[PDB]
Amino acid sequence: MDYGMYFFEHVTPYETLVRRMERVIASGKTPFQDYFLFESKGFGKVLILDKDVQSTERDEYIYHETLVHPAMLTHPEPKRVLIVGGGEGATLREVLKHPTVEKAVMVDIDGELVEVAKRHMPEWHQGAFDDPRAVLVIDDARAYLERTEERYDVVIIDLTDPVGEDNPARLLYTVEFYRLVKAHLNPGGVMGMQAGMILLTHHRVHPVVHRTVREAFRYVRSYKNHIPGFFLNFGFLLASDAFDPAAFSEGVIEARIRERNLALRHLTAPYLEAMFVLPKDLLEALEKETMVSTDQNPFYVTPEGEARQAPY
Amino acid sequence: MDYGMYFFEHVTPYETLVRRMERVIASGKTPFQDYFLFESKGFGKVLILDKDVQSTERDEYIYHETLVHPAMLTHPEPKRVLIVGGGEGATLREVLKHPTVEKAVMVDIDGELVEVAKRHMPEWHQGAFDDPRAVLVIDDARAYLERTEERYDVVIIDLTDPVGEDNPARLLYTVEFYRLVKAHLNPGGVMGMQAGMILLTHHRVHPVVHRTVREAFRYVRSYKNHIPGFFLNFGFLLASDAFDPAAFSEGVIEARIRERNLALRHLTAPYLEAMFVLPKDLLEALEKETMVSTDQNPFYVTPEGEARQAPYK
Amino acid sequence: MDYGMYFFEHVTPYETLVRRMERVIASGKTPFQDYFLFESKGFGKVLILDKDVQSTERDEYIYHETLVHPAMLTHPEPKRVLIVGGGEGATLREVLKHPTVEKAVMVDIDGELVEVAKRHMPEWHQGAFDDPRAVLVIDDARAYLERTEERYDVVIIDLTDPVGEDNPARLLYTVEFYRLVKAHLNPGGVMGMQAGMILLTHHRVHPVVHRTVREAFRYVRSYKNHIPGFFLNFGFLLASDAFDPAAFSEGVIEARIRERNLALRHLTAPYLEAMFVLPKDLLEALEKETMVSTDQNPFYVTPEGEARQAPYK
Amino acid sequence: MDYGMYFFEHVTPYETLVRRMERVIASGKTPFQDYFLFESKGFGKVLILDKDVQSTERDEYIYHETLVHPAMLTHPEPKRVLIVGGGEGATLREVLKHPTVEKAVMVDIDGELVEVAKRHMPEWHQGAFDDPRAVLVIDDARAYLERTEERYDVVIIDLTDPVGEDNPARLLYTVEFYRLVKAHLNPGGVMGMQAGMILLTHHRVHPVVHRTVREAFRYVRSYKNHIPGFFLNFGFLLASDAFDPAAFSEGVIEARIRERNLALRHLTAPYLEAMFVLPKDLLEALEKETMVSTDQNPFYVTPEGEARQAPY
Numbered sequence A, D: 001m002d003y004g005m006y007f008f009e010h011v012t013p014y015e016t017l018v019r020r021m022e023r024v025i026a027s028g029k030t031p032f033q034d035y036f037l038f039e040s041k042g043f044g045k046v047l048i049l050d051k052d053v054q055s056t057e058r059d060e061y062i063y064h065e066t067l068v069h070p071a072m073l074t075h076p077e078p079k080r081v082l083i084v085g086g087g088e089g090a091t092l093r094e095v096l097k098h099p100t101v102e103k104a105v106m107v108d109i110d111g112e113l114v115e116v117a118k119r120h121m122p123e124w125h126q127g128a129f130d131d132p133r134a135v136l137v138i139d140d141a142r143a144y145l146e147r148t149e150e151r152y153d154v155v156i157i158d159l160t161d162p163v164g165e166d167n168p169a170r171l172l173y174t175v176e177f178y179r180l181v182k183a184h185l186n187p188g189g190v191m192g193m194q195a196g197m198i199l200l201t202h203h204r205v206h207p208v209v210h211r212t213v214r215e216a217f218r219y220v221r222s223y224k225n226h227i228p229g230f231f232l233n234f235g236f237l238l239a240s241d242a243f244d245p246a247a248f249s250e251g252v253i254e255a256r257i258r259e260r261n262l263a264l265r266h267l268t269a270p271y272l273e274a275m276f277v278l279p280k281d282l283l284e285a286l287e288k289e290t291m292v293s294t295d296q297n298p299f300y301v302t303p304e305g306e307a308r309q310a311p312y
Numbered sequence B, C: 001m002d003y004g005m006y007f008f009e010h011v012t013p014y015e016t017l018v019r020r021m022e023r024v025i026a027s028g029k030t031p032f033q034d035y036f037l038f039e040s041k042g043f044g045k046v047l048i049l050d051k052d053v054q055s056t057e058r059d060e061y062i063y064h065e066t067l068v069h070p071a072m073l074t075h076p077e078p079k080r081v082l083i084v085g086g087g088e089g090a091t092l093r094e095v096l097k098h099p100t101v102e103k104a105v106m107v108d109i110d111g112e113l114v115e116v117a118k119r120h121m122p123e124w125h126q127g128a129f130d131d132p133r134a135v136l137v138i139d140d141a142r143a144y145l146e147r148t149e150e151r152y153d154v155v156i157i158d159l160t161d162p163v164g165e166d167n168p169a170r171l172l173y174t175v176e177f178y179r180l181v182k183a184h185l186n187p188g189g190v191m192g193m194q195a196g197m198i199l200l201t202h203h204r205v206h207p208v209v210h211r212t213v214r215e216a217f218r219y220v221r222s223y224k225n226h227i228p229g230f231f232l233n234f235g236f237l238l239a240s241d242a243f244d245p246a247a248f249s250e251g252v253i254e255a256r257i258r259e260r261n262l263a264l265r266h267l268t269a270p271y272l273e274a275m276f277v278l279p280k281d282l283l284e285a286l287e288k289e290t291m292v293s294t295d296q297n298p299f300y301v302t303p304e305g306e307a308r309q310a311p312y313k
């Protein structure tokens, strides 16, 4: 391809995405991770955290819609919402889009990266932060969830795979963490989350996530969607003790979409319910999975993609 | 990211996929294309044509299941199948998987490539090529179905995005070609084919392949699925002049699976039928596409990776 | 090999140098070229023009020492210097290092680039540009020395390999151009210039630049040296109509160094004079080169990276 | 650049050479290193060992000439020669080119790679092996030199940088190793060697080599030359107790070149003596160097290029 500036995105240990930069808007170091924000011609601005794309501007709508709305849509009347992780302000954006929302609290360990999302990714946050109903909190979720005891109707979890042994994002993907999410939910409340890529042909982050969350939640329902941006099939899930969040009654998602006036660009009612219908190979793997990650023994993925587990 | 052998695989003009080569198994230069077959730790053997990967081992089951059986399961008792393209002949193996089938004519320019597939790609063909029902034909499929009056229930067009001005195979991408295909159908007959990546920010290959086909059949149904080893969302479609191929029942597709003892590894009735549920953006992209392609001005793929029309040189 | 930002730097058509970008400092697109200045751990700030690196910080001292002082030290008391090209103005700083010098006219298309150098490349220019002896001229150096009757003792041609058919700067690579240069010399006067990589298996840029110049001066001496940050063997030369610029004494070059209190960091009298000792292969390549380039058929660099002649469009 | 097969050659930690392969002649694993032999269009066949180019076919003549002949030329009458390392059979080739040679013994730890040089690099060895005067020995040099006690007029050392901590090529770049080379030399004998790249702008393999060899040899003279193949300025040296191997008398290298009938393609007499005249920056660094690598404390280069030293 053309010669010039490029970014070597890791993807899998055998497949690297080399992606053209037209211009480096911003790049640096926080006390928690590396960022690069550059100008893709294809997807506009792109944001790497560490060695992995985080979002792209022209496609983020697909990911943010797919992460939020299936959880909000699947709750009858979402009033208080917690967003764990998710610093660009887009999860916020789509959460704020539901009018039954009075409060939306967003937590996220890394200030300067938010400060970066704000200075340089207006396209994302879109004003979000400065909405009255919002409350930025810069802490570690596990810390936040242990100290406060406010409760929520939906929690959205938008965190970063727990990759490699040393990583401390690991103590966020244990069952203890999810009972801890659970501990903070009203009755009728639902959890929503990104759970890692599916490429089940290498590997296993998605199904262990599903299995582990299963140990804290009665009803765990796993859905999927292609983020073009990532060139990758991403796994998400919905969880609840209170009811099966994917028994979708005829006409109802659509009902709510109207009442609520959702400006949507990717999702429609039937597409949304489609995300939930999985190929057989995804079913089988989701079923074969037995690893449950625990505080005692937190799971991580090898840099070969394999699921390991040991103390921290 | 190591050192060692890598492939450099075009994905669009701004994203390139660098793949780690465990060992080249065979490359060379047929009079119709460049090819590299190699061994990766990720997807088993990988196959490249010019700058793109035709197919991967660990995951071609998916692409092929997706391509074929829609079209096949939507036909109530298919007997005569045209497979245009598909050197590998996994396209054949999936087809030869339906009982009903008496004769499947595989038609493909590049028998030297087909030979590689034979010699090196067992994993794909799985004897498909020596089925007493297969007719290997070694010609430009446009010459063939023009040079014959033979009839079919299902065509399956397993071709390849037709890149660049200079290419006799942009002629496989026009409403006169899809008409040729149409003319060569039985009364119940359905086409089903592959129709490009879906990557709405770089280009409109899929929509335009779809627009081209809306022009030569009543009913055009796009479906798509995610092919892991491509790292792409691929776009497919079905077209027929008879029924809407998309308004099936889900009870019936199930019927015909269990019925014809299809071994499936990816598809299920539910999943299959869902592939046909498109998100708002993509339905618009389709309902908004205009460019139809014709022998007169065929469309090719710009090396900026978008749809363009221009007259026939 | 990590992840992070990389440059992709053309070296030939089959070797590419991927350089790790610590931080882009400034890129953009002047009406004459693309440019990227960035920060690497290896060589400090790196500067790219189109697909090649003009210069590196930790090691430009070398390229510049090598370019300039030969030519300068071979002239017994240089006063008036033409510097064609050399945006960075390290070419200036080295020149402005000789006492004898009264006036150095730097002449260079692209003042926007020169501005980058000013704003971002202090390390290079080192005030060179504000020497009461420097005349920044912002024109096509071919227009300039054609549009003037001014005279010089040393010219120094710090241009750039002239790649591709379309380029008004292939006109800076002909015997009519080097004659223009000649015509604009004093009686003792010497040219010295940069003359391409030396990479005898891919191409004959150096020999051909040399052959072109043999045509417009009596005495042509190739010398070369290894520029680390390029990972290339670069080729240079001196030409004069007066003496052989190559038959110096080594006692004398030493004289003139100590004499003019040249701070040197790379060159020494011995080393400098040795750059002029070529191996068998390279002397043949030179004695075997034929292609001369002319306004009539100027030579450009093929994107297969070899010398080609073709008439003026 | 074009799309297709490529090889990612390491070079420096900040600069990688990505080099086009037209065809993979051969590649595999020995019990000691990795090989890849491929078809460059530029340089013809190329041979990687591990992650580093070893030779290229159209340019090897430059490297092999530059490694051998300055040592052989600088000996009055070279009869017995030892070549440590150097498995392609090219050092052999040029050593055999001097007619005063009756025996030439070549040692090299890795059989299968020789077996590979023979099956697939005819261009290199050129018959070499099958010359009567030659004697292939497949051992570790240090082992070979400790067991036998034959002696030699020139030793050529053509080994592979000692790179990274775990590497066992390290015990080959100590002073004890060179006293051990020395221990095996007739009087009037000279050592010749590749000593690593010069890029003194990163780093230091060349000057420590020079300094260490200096501790076993009275006269160590360091010369250099650009191998196009490697895109890199490579450092070599000549050593002797018996006399200054780079006091070059007027007309003498040339004298010997004639008498001996050297078919040379790169070197000439004056070029050969030129290699010995170094830039100031190379002089200064050669002089500032103080690290001497020892059995007790073997030196290696960091993967950042820095010279370290500790026990093994």
Ligand SMILES: CSC[C@H]1O[C@@H](n2cnc3c(N)ncnc32)[C@H](O)[C@@H]1O
Pocket: A049, A054, A084, A085, A086, A087, A088, A107, A108, A109, A110, A113, A139, A140, A141, A142, A158, A159, A160, A169, A172
């Ligand atoms: C990168 S995906 C997600 C976002 O969640 C953030 N994040 C990572 N770890 C935590 C944590 N322990 N608590 C809250 N947010 C986190 C990261 O800064 C990023 O902005």
Ligand SMILES: CSC[C@H]1O[C@@H](n2cnc3c(N)ncnc32)[C@H](O)[C@@H]1O
Pocket: B049, B054, B084, B085, B086, B087, B088, B107, B108, B109, B110, B113, B139, B140, B141, B142, B158, B159, B160, B168, B169, B172
């Ligand atoms: C590998 S998927 C592809 C197949 O489509 C084949 N193909 C390419 N062009 C044509 C054509 N004009 N007619 C039939 N098959 C073709 C390729 O040769 C390959 O076999």
Ligand SMILES: CSC[C@H]1O[C@@H](n2cnc3c(N)ncnc32)[C@H](O)[C@@H]1O
Pocket: C049, C054, C084, C085, C086, C087, C088, C107, C108, C109, C110, C113, C139, C140, C141, C142, C158, C159, C160, C168, C169, C172
């Ligand atoms: C950076 S080394 C190079 C310099 O030569 C300059 N250059 C390129 N073309 C011309 C030309 N036709 N006349 C004068 N200088 C030029 C470039 O603009 C750069 O300043």
Ligand SMILES: CSC[C@H]1O[C@@H](n2cnc3c(N)ncnc32)[C@H](O)[C@@H]1O
Pocket: D049, D054, D084, D085, D086, D087, D088, D107, D108, D109, D110, D113, D139, D140, D141, D142, D158, D159, D160, D169, D172
């Ligand atoms: C790669 S540069 C040099 C050659 O010397 C060889 N070599 C490496 N270590 C030793 C050793 N201890 N003794 C002899 N030869 C070696 C390598 O196999 C290679 O062929």
